[PDB]
């Protein structure tokens, strides 16, 4: 059947109706605009090269901060030392762009599907 | 209104008003169509064909003049020239080649002008056309950037006029001031001419 259909021509916006007002639609709320006070920044433009210098100084400061520069009881046991290198996970937390193979999905699906 | 730039709808409405002999209506439609869609070759072709089938050769010429104002592709200039060659105003077709080589300065248009002047004009006109082609193409694109086919057609034309030494001069000049990677066809035609 073709009762159930896609959209190939989505609905188009209309201008407002130029009619007499009787209907109530939007109750007033937050009718006062806040402005950036002195100290809240924004209302001060200095130049371009000063901004570039400040940006590069902040980047150099962050890189400086990151760098830091100013009978034995276990002898009949069949297998010994099976857990070397297992605790070494956590060298650097790494992002994989696959939500089916990310570590979050594996943790989630091992927690829940028991 | 719903589909303004649809060529099929435009042609359907024009033909629907042409089948009922509403010629003035359909000419208004064709002006509106080629105003709305100036770079659609089918609408321009339909307007020039309708004007030629109605007998108005000056109307066909004015429609072609507006189209050539719009700087169309090669086939439109070719169609205009074939019109004027059909009706015999060869000087008008010569003017159209002047503007056509202005708009499309590729060697194909120069060769087409040379062939046209060979068949419908004096040999001095062909020599002037070929010299203008070599001069313009080596001036704009660079002296080493001139096409070998220009020298081929010029030398074969001077061969056809039996000015044999002049053809040897064209061939030798082409083999001198061209790279070796772009004169192999010129070299082969030179060998054919020399042992011919």
């Amino acid at each position: 059947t073709t009762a159930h259909r896609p959209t190939f021509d989505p609905a188009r916006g209309k201008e407002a109706l130029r009619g007499p007002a009787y209907h109530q639609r939007l109750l007033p709320a937050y009718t006062t605009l806040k402005f950036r006070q002195p100290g809240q920044g924004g209302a001060a433009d200095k130049s371009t090269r000063d901004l570039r210098a400040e940006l590069e100084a902040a980047e150099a400061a962050h890189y400086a901060k990151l760098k830091g520069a100013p009978r034995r009881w276990d002898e009949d046991v069949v297998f010994k030392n099976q857990a070397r290198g297992t605790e070494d996970k956590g060298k650097r937390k790494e992002f994989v762009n696959d939500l089916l193979r990310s570590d979050f999905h594996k943790r989630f699906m091992s927690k829940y599907v028991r | 209104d719903v589909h303004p730039n649809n060529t099929q709808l435009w042609i359907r409405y024009i033909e629907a008003e042409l089948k009922n002999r509403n010629i003035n209506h359909a000419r208004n439609l064709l002006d509106r169509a080629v105003t709305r869609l100036p770079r659609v070759s089918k609408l321009w072709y339909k307007y020039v064909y309708v004007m030629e089938m109605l007998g108005d050769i000056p109307g066909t010429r004015q429609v072609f003049d507006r189209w050539m104002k719009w700087e169309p592709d090669e086939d439109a200039w070719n169609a205009y020239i074939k019109l004027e060659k059909r009706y015999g105003e060869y000087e008008r077709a010569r003017q159209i080649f002047a503007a056509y080589t202005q708009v499309h300065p590729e060697p194909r248009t120069w060769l087409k002008w040379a062939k046209f002047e060979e068949e419908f004009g004096t040999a001095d006109m062909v020599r002037d056309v070929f010299q203008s082609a070599i001069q313009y193409i080596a001036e704009t694109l660079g002296d080493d950037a001139v096409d070998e086919r220009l020298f081929i057609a010029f030398a074969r034309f001077e061969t056809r006029q039996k000015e044999y030494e002049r053809a040897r001069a064209i061939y030798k000049f082409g083999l001198d001031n061209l790279p070796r990677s772009r004169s192999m066809q010129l070299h082969a035609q030179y060998t054919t001419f020399e042992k011919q």
Partner: protein, 145 residues
Amino acid sequence: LLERWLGNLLSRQFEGRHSKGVAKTVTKQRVESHFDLELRASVMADLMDMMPEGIKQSKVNTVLQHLSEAWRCWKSNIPWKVPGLPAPIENIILRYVKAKADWWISVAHYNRERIRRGATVDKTVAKKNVGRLTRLWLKAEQERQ
């Protein structure tokens, strides 16, 4: 409140109902249908912008049917490779199937947390969520085999 309500009641009575004036919000019963509306619009815009000029664009909803089948093949872990489908169209389809899949998996994670906590009581949410995690487990187990 009541004078507002009676004024709107009398507005419907005396100047009529404006049946589709203002856009309805995307409430929870319209989330997946709205995601589908937006997804189909986005895929269609990419095809209408990446096709060359002059190509006969008569059959382009066919790409949207390909996107639907590609999504179904993603859910059922069946490899999707249409013979003769061009690389540009295939790239668009694979890109948006990845995007839809990520939205699906995130919604599954969120509802599973809410089902664990008891924050929801609707049966449909639980049924949908068990279906999603059954598919996810079987995808992981096919990968394991």
